[PDB]
UniProtKB/Swiss-Prot annotation, chain A:
Species this chain originates from: Homo sapiens (Human)
Disease: Immunodeficiency 67: An autosomal recessive primary immunodeficiency characterized by recurrent, life-threatening systemic and invasive bacterial infections beginning in infancy or early childhood.
Keyword ATP-binding recorded: yes
Lineage summary: Eukaryota, Metazoa, Chordata, Craniata, Vertebrata
Included range, full protein: 165 to 458 of 460
Reactions mediated catalytically: L-seryl-[protein] + ATP = O-phospho-L-seryl-[protein] + ADP + H(+); L-threonyl-[protein] + ATP = O-phospho-L-threonyl-[protein] + ADP + H(+)
Active-site residues, as the UniProt record annotates them: N137
GO biological process, one term: innate immune response
Protein name (record): Interleukin-1 receptor-associated kinase 4
Amino acid sequence: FHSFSFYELKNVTNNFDERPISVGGNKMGEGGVVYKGYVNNTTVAVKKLATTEELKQQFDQEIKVMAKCQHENLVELLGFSSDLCLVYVYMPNGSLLDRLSCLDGTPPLSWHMRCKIAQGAANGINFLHENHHIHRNIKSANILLDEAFTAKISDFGLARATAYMAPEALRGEITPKSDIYSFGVVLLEIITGLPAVDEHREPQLLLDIKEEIEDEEKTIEDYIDKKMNDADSTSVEAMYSVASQCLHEKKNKRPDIKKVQQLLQEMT
Amino acid sequence: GSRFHSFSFYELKNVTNNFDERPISVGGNKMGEGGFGVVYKGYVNNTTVAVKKLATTEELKQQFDQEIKVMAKCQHENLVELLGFSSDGDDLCLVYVYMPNGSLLDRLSCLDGTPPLSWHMRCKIAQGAANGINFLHENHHIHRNIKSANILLDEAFTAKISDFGLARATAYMAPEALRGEITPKSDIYSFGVVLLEIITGLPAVDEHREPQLLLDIKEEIEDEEKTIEDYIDKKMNDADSTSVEAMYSVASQCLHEKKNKRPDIKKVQQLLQEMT
Ligand SMILES: COc1cc(N2CCOCC2)ccc1NC(=O)c1cnc(-c2cccnc2)s1
Ligand SMILES: COc1cc(N2CCOCC2)ccc1NC(=O)c1cnc(-c2cccnc2)s1
């Protein structure tokens, strides 16, 4: 790793300027707050956390996993700082969530680009499960996009050996099959371009459109992101089938990640 | 809480042998425990009563207040009656009418070698409990802690609900409840688990069982990997296959993952009636 001074990280983020980028500040996202930092002629992403021992276990746990798991579809952790700070490679196209809601006037992702992203995301989850890690916080905000819109998973604070959470996950069980479920919600966001939860929407939870469509109260067509041109019905119907399976209430009925990989590959 | 009596903490302490924590069975005063306290055997006016001594602190007082608030509104054949309360002393206490046959959980687990409940009594108890829940929902309340431990049994094995501390106007909780939604369809879900307890005589959770949650046998049975008859409580001799399957059918409907696909309480009552 690299070691970073809290002093140094403070200066390269303009003293952790919490104003948004779109104002001339340094904040890129929050959930922890992620800042844009400038080191020499390179750009980095600095997450600064905000019980406190819970924060500490998460801080620690993220570093433990990052040390072991390195992969093309995982965000690289350059370094650390001990407030607690984590330093990552900057991902120029930001989060899946940002691009899906077309933040900052970026053009909508194409269907072609969304399938590649679904596939890269699944590849990253597979690497984790292959090495007996469970992510526990898979979501649109935690999938990041490099210069080529390659998907990379991040935010391992909760990794171990609401809108996104499986029933058993909510019951407190720890299973890689909960990652699968969460990934299902991500796939619905990818298809619809809608947020996983919307207090003013019906239904409030995106995962619930699965029931609407099963009851024939809606159709997939009713929900497809109207902002893309290249979405053929077949492949969209195929990604949905994947999401539907992933969202099964019983963990045992959900496909494992390798099977999800195969299905997403057959899709294209 | 003007409909109730205010009791001195000292007098409750006196009549529970100073809240003697050893079990009734060895001459102590503890009858049960769990939800925010311990329930002791006590007396008022030479009559046996149940005394719950509550055990943060401001959440506790609010649950204390909430239960008194709710008992003041809700009186019914299938709800436990509150006699009074104590808050003057070192701990908050709630004093209830004594329920001689204890909790449904005690009786299903055959606590202290007591005989198994017959199938006909399990049916009376399932109907009584549903009737208590109907009364709550009719009066626009949500119980939020329906479980076999909170269904008590009088001399006639008449089912009476209690523990209203969480009432609003993990092994038991529906998916949407775990997400912090508050809806009466969640009580239905919990009641579904209770119905499985009644059919199987198994605890809602067993850390050492497969599956660990009784909820999960539903998936096992639908797969035909196991049958109802595999799980039926083998200690009753009067359980006929038709009505057992009918009760299981009701439980299975209550345990639908989606709340809008569950029967409301009146439908549950009808289905239970059509069983008997
Ligand atoms: C919101 O995130 C970003 C936004 C942008 N945009 C781009 C367009 O202009 C406005 C901001 C750029 C980059 C990023 N992020 C990164 O570079 C990250 C690297 N690792 C990270 C992480 C995130 C969460 C939890 N754990 C780790 S984020
Ligand atoms: C476990 O409870 C009992 C056990 C027994 N047995 C009998 C046989 O020997 C051993 C103990 C008797 C009675 C009771 N209970 C009552 O009488 C109750 C009246 N209100 C109640 C309550 C319970 C919870 C939360 N809130 C209220 S308890």
